[PDB]
Amino acid sequence: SMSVKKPKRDDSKDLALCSMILTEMETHEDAWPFLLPVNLKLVPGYKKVIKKPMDFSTIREKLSSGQYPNLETFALDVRLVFDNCETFNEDDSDIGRAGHNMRKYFEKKWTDTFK
Description:
Radius of gyration: 16 Å
Structural class: mainly alpha
CATH class: Mainly Alpha
Number of strands: 0
Assembly: monomeric
Number of helices: 5
Distance between the termini: 25 Å
Helix content: 55-70%
Protein name: Bromodomain adjacent to zinc finger domain protein 2B
Oligomer: monomer
Order of helices and strands: HHHHH
PDB class: dna binding protein
Number of domains: 1
Subcellular location: Nucleus
Family: Belongs to the WAL family.
């Protein structure tokens, strides 16, 4: 509270480490559904159903331009990618499986890096 602070957790490496994680995700073989924004002209249903589209390119641009105030807002956008994928795609489709695999991959790198 006022003039009473918890000890300072060192955040100075967070940007670099989120960038490394994101590089790892961009280079995964199963990243292909997630590399660019879903084309809203060519994918019926996507625009109306998925209220907050998110993709790795958009996260990379946000990361590069200071639009994440902290590492939790970065993790929220990554998880949004996989949450959107589960909303729109059957678990037993190639895209649906890709999204599960990517989520698993991310969450391990997240825990190993920060927890």
